[PDB]
Amino acid sequence: MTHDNKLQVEAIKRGTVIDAIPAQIGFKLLSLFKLTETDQRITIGLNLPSGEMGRKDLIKIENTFLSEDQVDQLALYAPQATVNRIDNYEVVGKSRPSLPERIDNVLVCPNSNCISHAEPVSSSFAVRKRANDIALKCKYCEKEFSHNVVLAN
Amino acid sequence: MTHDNKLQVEAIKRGTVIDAIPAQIGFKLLSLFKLTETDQRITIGLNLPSGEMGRKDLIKIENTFLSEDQVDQLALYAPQATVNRIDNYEVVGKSRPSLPERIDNVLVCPNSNCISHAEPVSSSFAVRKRANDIALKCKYCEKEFSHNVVLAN
Amino acid sequence: ANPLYQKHIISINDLSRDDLNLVLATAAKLKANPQPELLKHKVIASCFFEASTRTRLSFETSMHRLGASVVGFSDSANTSLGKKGETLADTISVISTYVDAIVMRHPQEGAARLATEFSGNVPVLNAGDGSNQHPTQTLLDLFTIQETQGRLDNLHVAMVGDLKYGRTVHSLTQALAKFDGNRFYFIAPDALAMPQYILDMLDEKGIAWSLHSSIEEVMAEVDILYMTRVQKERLDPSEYANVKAQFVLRASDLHNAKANMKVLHPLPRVDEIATDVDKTPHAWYFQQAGNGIFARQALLALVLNRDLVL
Amino acid sequence: ANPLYQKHIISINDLSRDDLNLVLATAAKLKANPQPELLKHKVIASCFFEASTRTRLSFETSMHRLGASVVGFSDSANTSLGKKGETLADTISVISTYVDAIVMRHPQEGAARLATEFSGNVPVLNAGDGSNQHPTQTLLDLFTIQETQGRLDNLHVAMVGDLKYGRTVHSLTQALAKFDGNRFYFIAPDALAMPQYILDMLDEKGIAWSLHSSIEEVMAEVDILYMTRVQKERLDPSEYANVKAQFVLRASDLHNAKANMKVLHPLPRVDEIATDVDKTPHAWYFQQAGNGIFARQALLALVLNRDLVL
Amino acid sequence: ANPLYQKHIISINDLSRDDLNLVLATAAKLKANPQPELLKHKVIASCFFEASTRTRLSFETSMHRLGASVVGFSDSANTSLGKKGETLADTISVISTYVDAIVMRHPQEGAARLATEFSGNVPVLNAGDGSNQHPTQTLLDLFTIQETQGRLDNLHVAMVGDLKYGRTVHSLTQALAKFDGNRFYFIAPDALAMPQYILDMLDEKGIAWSLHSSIEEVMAEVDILYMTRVQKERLDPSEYANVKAQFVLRASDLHNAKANMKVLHPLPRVDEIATDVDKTPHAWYFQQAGNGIFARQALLALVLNRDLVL
Amino acid sequence: ANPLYQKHIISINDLSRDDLNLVLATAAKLKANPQPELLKHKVIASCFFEASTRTRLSFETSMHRLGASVVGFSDSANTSLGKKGETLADTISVISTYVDAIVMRHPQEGAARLATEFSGNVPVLNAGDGSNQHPTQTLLDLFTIQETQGRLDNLHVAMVGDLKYGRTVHSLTQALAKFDGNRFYFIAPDALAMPQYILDMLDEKGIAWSLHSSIEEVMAEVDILYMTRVQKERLDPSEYANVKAQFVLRASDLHNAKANMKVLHPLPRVDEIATDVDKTPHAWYFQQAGNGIFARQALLALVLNRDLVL
Ligand SMILES: [Zn+2]
Ligand SMILES: [Zn+2]
């Protein structure tokens, strides 16, 4: 993707590079998934230029690897992000975000009466895609919501 | 500034560079002061090898300069930080976090009966140093708490 | 003696286009050149059988601005009111022997109407009656509309929220359907749609109205955006949450609105309108709340004063 | 061990066709030959965080008919809040150390589900978690439909009342949908219609259903008439009265009903089933409440016993 | 225009020695030569979000003595106020469009301060806010002290009771620490001592204060004896009883007091001061309560009137 | 006959070292080998004049695990008073004629003691009499300390929280003081310190104790960490927040704790023990609540049986 060989960010020898994160989502990803609570070198680039999409975000975590599941979790936010596994200064393998079947801890139930709101429990939603969108069903109240609503502001 | 290692290093055209942020404080600052809410190219460096000071966080905000007042807000979180002004690829200016007079909308009054909690108002505390310990007095309930207490939140 | 002199103000339907305009003309004048002793020596009963602070405070302030005295009460929280005892007919029969006018708010539809049959010569003003009328709130909504749009004919008015149970949107629709060429846009959740009956009346007049599912869908073309409070109890918290996002106004949604467009809300807003809107020039709910004073002073002056000298 | 041994009964969506037949086969045997000392020495907690005298009395009679002891409590509150603090999690973590099973009713959805996360090896049985589930009422209904019709497949079922909110009809529709050839007639006013998510599942599973205006149109076909209470609070008093008549059952309407046709109702019925219906052989709402005793004994017997020698 | 004209009266700390004296000078004058129509035509909102009859009656009487009108409310006993609904910000935004000044008492610290940010040009006076301020009570305590001692400098003042949680003793200490040479004697139970913070501030000024365990221990040398109510809830009834005897004033304890010494108490007294003291010339709590009227008339006159002509 | 046969269990001060060991030895045997029909035919009254669901549920489960029947009632009230009249004396004189033992909780101190004066030959067991005693909670704690530490002498016990008011820590300190070589670390904010009467008894008996500022200073030494809830109501919200942090336990603080170290808490814990503590092997508050079942069965078995064949 974006290739600057002049003022460019320093490359990582080994780790994970999440590229193509759409702009303004990169920070959310760090927050949501607690990506900063580590001692490893993390390099974040925000609002990076890439004619492919204008501005994109990018994250490089050193000596750290995301499993298939973990990567799948980015599916709601940066669905087109590319997770390139790095080793010895070369992309030893890529990865695309697949929509998983279940999503834990990061979401909040829209249902005001859901018990998950006042208790020591990790939210969990079942994911099922249905034309035009993705439905999310709460493990607790069992109410099904459109992702668009679960991902409110 | 540029962590010129061996191969490559990045640099912004002109803007601000916040260096010497103690480890684990970098991300907080991005979150708290909502620095990531710009169309500007932001470059973040977390857990960088400081060797002497240890591990540090680094933030570079392009075409963006911080007023002395803004620099002062960093005092409670990263008083050691150095905020560098860059113009024409070089450090035209260099300032450091000085203890502010007031601290707006980033803290939370630990007084649970304070009117500030449930309302459309930005918090505000009066900073009063009493030899290293910093007492923070709420603008609303007028209670004075130790900076330790307020900061846990 | 003025058209409204000694009349009872029960339902908006009892007021003609000429009456509405008379009240609104008087209100504007009372706002310009105040008359603080106009009602000096009158005693008005503030009878809130149903408690409502915003409304009571506003009516009473109105009474005070004109020099009148006020006696009254609020929230008759009788422990389980199977029978509070005395009939309302009896209470009004007694109270009408003390005061010069009665402003009442009651929980049951038709209460101010009944009162009328026992107050003798004493005028009774409806401060709200069940899910039926609330005429003073409308006089205030129209006065705020005329003041900001300069007219009550040929407006593009949007009504958003609980169109089904909102007694105020029902009344505003009827009042404005008395002026000409108004186009209505009804934005409401499927379960809270404008009652058929209102649509029916509108059609008879040959007035235009369209139903929209989104506010930004009509944003660009409205002069007035009248938001109402969607009460969660009327809904399931999941379905509430399912529709919420579709009817809450944020400053962003206003980027396409016209310069003259204003947002009104009978208040209280809570979820529906974000505070960020408060800061825009389109926010007019607090100003709308202030106009209640003139709309209310006007009404009282007209009813209690043979001829208005202004 | 039987399939339901030591299992939590939270939602109907968690049980299968077999599980349902297993509970109903056991219920039948216990109704035929009671086992007054099967659960002796067992202590069970009847935790009604939300009071429900009818449901509690039945559940506890069930526990006593099997020889178990009961400790518990009904309701917990203030006015519109409650008290101070202690999570449902700690409450269940504590109680889980005394008793052998937990029956519980709670105002928030998902409460029973959360309890299973803190109860350890103690099975949690849901007696109602807000607008979500109520497993035992559906088992009691199913046992009543089977007992009187002889089967759970190929039935003509008509549901009447408040289908939008009735958590019992949503659940019964989902339970019956696990069997074959059933046909559903939904008869509700427009404001209280069967939600689309249920309609969708029916469609998806190729199950026949249809909306009707009045019980009359379909009385002749129906095998089971399931009624629900349309609470006046879900409607404005005026609205209520207009629809009301369309969904009120009299003995005279049963006129053309099949011999086997039974009228069911979760109760309290109030206005919906006229008293003259109680005298027809079709009235089975009281006999349905009595069966709750056996569907409930069945669950407890199955969840606490590794094997039943029935 | 006078220093206090249009200012908000939120905390005693916002008032300088010059402001206190200006209010006190005005109060004495209003007491001598009354001005019953000074505020004629103003409408003041008496907003007691927290009910307090003594304080409301006094403020309102003050409003009436100057010719002003009053609209308002008291004890908003919402059943379990998890959310009373409207934000306080919104209530003040609306009320400030009706009235000319707002006197408010609220349960939460900082409420009058917040109000200030939404009342626009309308002054808001703090009638009590949580455990923070209550400036009008202090203006009344100082006016009663100056009236009886002839001065606010060089006094030997004793403060007895719940020095820890008494918002009034905290304020009186700060106000008097603005005048020179005052010596404070703090008589309080170990569990209810003067907060460290107050002692700290006092020391900075280089003001003297001593802690006593008994009242008669300092009886002989005090000019003012300011008793406060020790609330039993803050204590155990046994420990309460254990310390009670040590802080209740009886006429006997006064046999050594000076001729000029007066006993003040914000009221209500109950246990702390025996009725036998009422009969002595040192009793001044009821007179102190009467001075609230002039202290309050003064404050309102200054804020609502460009220049005080006296 | 055993020493506790037919005896009242009112205060911990009434039982001896032996009595304590006898109750705990029996508790252990019943926990090992249950006797589900020891108290069959016995009817016991669970009289909770002061509601306490947690304590009642446990006591009653205990009664049922021994085969006894339970009749009783929870709470009795109005708002801030109650009803008319009937002494506790007559109430006990009546109930004493039906049942075989009385378990009772009451808001006033000394209530259980007075009951023994009117109950005749029926033993009265105290489940809590105001701020005074609560015998069974101390027996349950002691049984938990012994079960996990292997002894009641030579322990390092740290008590944290509200020591001034916690009736459970006062009592536990008195119980442990009957054994040898125990050392106590008291860790409380200055306003909630261990009363002097307890400190005096410790001194008098040559028992070592010491105040500490934070759990940190002494974590390494402690065998038992007993926590209590500091109710925010005992402090002003501002005050609370400043101390709070000093007496809140996180999993990370347990870092340097001994293998055998157990964290105990009467419950409800709210803010004081972070949830991440529940996952460490040190968390034993839930297992302590479960033991209440056996310390309680022990008492009932001993008081109602002349001899135990355990
Ligand atoms: Zn949920
Ligand atoms: Zn505050």
Residue type, C35: Q
DSSP C194: P
Q: Which residues of D touch C191 (CB under 8 A)?
A: 191
Chains that touch A (3 or more CB pairs under 8 A): B, C, D
What is the C-alpha separation between E169 and B12, in angstroms, rounded? 59
What is the C-alpha separation between E3 and C215, in angstroms, rounded? 50
Q: Is residue B1 assigned to a domain?
A: no
Q: Which residues of E touch B120 (CB under 8 A)?
A: 87, 89
In Å, how far from its chain's centre is CA F209? Answer: 21
Calculate how far, in angstroms, residue D103's C-alpha sits from the geometric centre of ligand 1: 21
Which structural domain range is residue A80 located in? 8-100
DSSP characters over F193-218 = PPPHHHHHHHHHTT-EEEE-S-GGGG
Strands C124-129 vs C156-160: parallel, antiparallel or unpaired: unpaired
Q: Which residue has the tokens 């999993």?
A: F251
Q: What is the 3-state secondary structure (H, E, C) of chain A?
A: CCCCCCCCCCCCCEEEEEEEEECCCHHHHHHHCCCCCCCCCEEEEEEEEECCCEEEEEEEEECCCCCHHHHHHHHHCCCCCEEEEEECCEEEECCCCCCCCEEECCCCCCCCCEHHHCCCCCCEEEEEEECCEEEEEECCCCCEEEHHHHCCC
Give yes or no: F168 in active site: no
Mark which of A85, A100, A115 sits at the end of a domain.
Answer: A100
Residues C20, C40 contacting (CB under 8 angstroms): no
E72 backbone dihedrals φ, ψ, rounded to 5°: 165, -165
CATH number for position B93: 3.30.70.140
Closest by Cα among F192, F191, F179, F189 to F146: F179
B-E contacts (CB, under 8 Å)? 52
For residues A80 and A117, membership in a common domain is answered with no
SS3 F72: strand
Closest partner residue to B10 among A9, A42, A47, by Cβ? A9
Closest by Cα among B36, B25, B18, B26 to B85: B18
Q: Which residues of E touch C73 (CB under 8 A)?
A: none
CA distances from E146 to B69, E136, E140, E254, E262 (A): 45, 15, 10, 21, 11
What is the C-alpha separation between C70 and C54, in angstroms, rounded? 16
Residues with CB under 5 A from ligand 2 (ion): B 109, 111, 114, 116, 138, 140-141
Using CA coordinates, name the residue in chain A closest to C240. A111
Inter-chain CB proximity D109 and A118 less than 8 Å: no
What is the C-alpha separation between A56 and A48, in angstroms, rounded? 5
Closest by Cα among D54, A62, E144, C111 to B47: A62
Closest by Cα among F91, F132, F87, F88 to F109: F132
Let me know if A52 is exposed, middle or buried by CB neighbors in 10 A (0-12, 13-18, 19+): exposed
Annotated binding-site residue? F84: yes
Structure tokens at C85: 């005892």
Annotated binding-site residue? C170: no
Using CA coordinates, name the residue in chain A closest to B27. A36
Q: Does B contact A via 3+ CB–CB distances below 8 Å?
A: yes
CA distances from F183 to B90, B97, F22, F170 (A): 65, 49, 24, 15
Inter-chain CB proximity C131 and D191 less than 8 Å: no
Q: Strand pairing partners for F104?
A: F47, F126
Q: Which residues of C touch D165 (CB under 8 A)?
A: 236
What is the C-alpha separation between D222 and D212, in angstroms, rounded? 12
Calculate how far, in angstroms, residue A115's C-alpha sits from the geometric centre of ligand 1: 7
Q: Which residues contact C51 (CB under 8 A, 6 or more apart)?
A: C74, C75
Using CA coordinates, name the residue in chain B closest to F243. B149
Using CA coordinates, name the residue in chain E closest to D81. E80
What is the C-alpha separation between A114 and E72, in angstroms, rounded? 39
Closest by Cα among F292, F289, F144 to D92: F289
Closest by Cα among C111, C14, C41, C28 to C3: C14
What is the C-alpha separation between A135 and A148, in angstroms, rounded? 9
Angle between helix D285-304 and D17-32 (nearest 10): 100
Q: What is the 3-state secondary structure (H, E, C) of F225-277?
A: EEECCCCHHHCCHHHHHHHHHHHCECCCHHHHCCCCCEEECCCCCCCCECHHH
What is the C-alpha separation between A4 and A8, in angstroms, rounded? 5
Inter-chain CB proximity C238 and A141 less than 8 Å: yes
For residues A144 and A91, membership in a common domain is answered with no
Q: Which residues contact B145 (CB under 8 A, 6 or more apart)?
A: B109, B110, B111, B135, B136, B137, B138, F238, F241, F242
> Catalytic pick from F56, F65, F105, F106?
F105
Q: Is residue B2 assigned to a domain?
A: no
- Give the number of other Cβ atoms within 10 Å of residue D307's Cβ: 9
Ligand at shortest distance from the CA of B140 = 2
Between the two ends of chain F, the Cα-to-Cα distance in Å is: 14
Q: Which residues of A touch C237 (CB under 8 A)?
A: 111-113
Q: Does A contact E via 3+ CB–CB distances below 8 Å?
A: no
Residues C294, C30 contacting (CB under 8 angstroms): yes
SS3 E157: strand
Q: Which residues contact B31 (CB under 8 A, 6 or more apart)?
A: A31
Structure tokens at D211: 């909306």
Is the CB of residue F259 less than 8 Å away from at least one CB of chain B? Answer: no
Q: Strands (DSSP E) along chain D, which ranges?
A: 43-48, 69-74, 101-106, 124-129, 156-160, 183-187, 208-211, 224-227, 262-264
Residues D112, D56 contacting (CB under 8 angstroms): no
Closest by Cα among D143, D144, D104 to D122: D104
For residues A80 and A121, membership in a common domain is answered with no
Domain span(s) for CATH 3.40.50.1370 in chain E: 1-133+292-310, 134-291
Chain breaks in chain A (C to N over 2.5 A) after: none
Closest partner residue to A116 among D107, D110, D131, by Cβ? D110
DSSP D233: G
Ligand at shortest distance from the CA of A114 = 1
Calculate how far, in angstroms, residue D119's C-alpha sits from the geometric centre of ligand 1: 20
SS3 B70: helix
Annotated binding-site residue? F134: yes
CATH number for position A129: 2.30.30.20
What is the C-alpha separation between F128 and F108, in angstroms, rounded? 9
For residues A59 and A121, membership in a common domain is answered with no
Give yes or no: F134 in active site: yes
What is the C-alpha separation between C193 and C186, in angstroms, rounded? 8
Residue type, F306: R
Which residues, numbered 127 to 166 in chain E, qualify as contacts with chain B under a Cβ-Cβ cut-off of 8 Å? 129-133
Using CA coordinates, name the residue in chain D closest to C189. D191
Strand order across the D208-211 sheet: D208-211, D183-187, D156-160, D224-227, D262-264
What is the C-alpha separation between C129 and C107, in angstroms, rounded? 6
For residues A28 and A68, membership in a common domain is answered with yes
Q: How was this structure determined?
A: X-ray
Q: Does C contact F via 3+ CB–CB distances below 8 Å?
A: no
Q: Is residue A124 assigned to a domain?
A: yes
What is the C-alpha separation between E235 and A27, in angstroms, rounded? 51
Reported as type and span, the H/E element at residue F31 is helix F17-32
Q: Exposure pattern of E69-107 as b/e (b: 16+ CB <10 Å)?
A: bbbbbeebeeeeeeeeebbbbbbbbbbbbbbbbbbbbbb
Strand order across the C224-227 sheet: C208-212, C183-187, C156-160, C224-227, C262-264
Structure tokens at A130: 């249905």
- Give the number of other Cβ atoms within 10 Å of residue C72's Cβ: 18
Structure tokens at C280: 């825009």
Annotated binding-site residue? E267: yes
For residues A26 and A91, membership in a common domain is answered with yes
Domain count, chain B: 2
Residues of E annotated as catalytic are 54-55, 84, 105, 134
Annotated binding-site residue? D234: no
Q: Which residues contact B106 (CB under 8 A, 6 or more apart)?
A: B32, B33, B73, B123
Residues of D annotated as catalytic are 54-55, 84, 105, 134
For residues A29 and A69, membership in a common domain is answered with yes
CATH 3.40.50.1370 is the classification of domain F1-133+292-310: yes
Q: Is residue B96 assigned to a domain?
A: yes
What is the C-alpha separation between E200 and C190, in angstroms, rounded? 64
The CATH number of F134-291 is: 3.40.50.1370
What is the C-alpha separation between F96 and E253, in angstroms, rounded? 52
Q: Which residues of F touch E196 (CB under 8 A)?
A: none
Calculate how far, in angstroms, residue B150's C-alpha sits from the geometric centre of ligand 2: 10
Q: Exposure pattern of B125-152 as b/e (b: 16+ CB <10 Å)?
A: bebeeeeeebbbbbbbbbbbbbbebbee
What is the C-alpha separation between F26 and F297, in angstroms, rounded? 9
Give yes or no: C84 in active site: yes
Let me know if F221 is exposed, middle or buried by CB neighbors in 10 A (0-12, 13-18, 19+): middle
CA distances from B113 to A134, E111, E118, F233 (A): 42, 10, 20, 12
* Least Cα separation, residue D83 to chain F (angstroms): 12
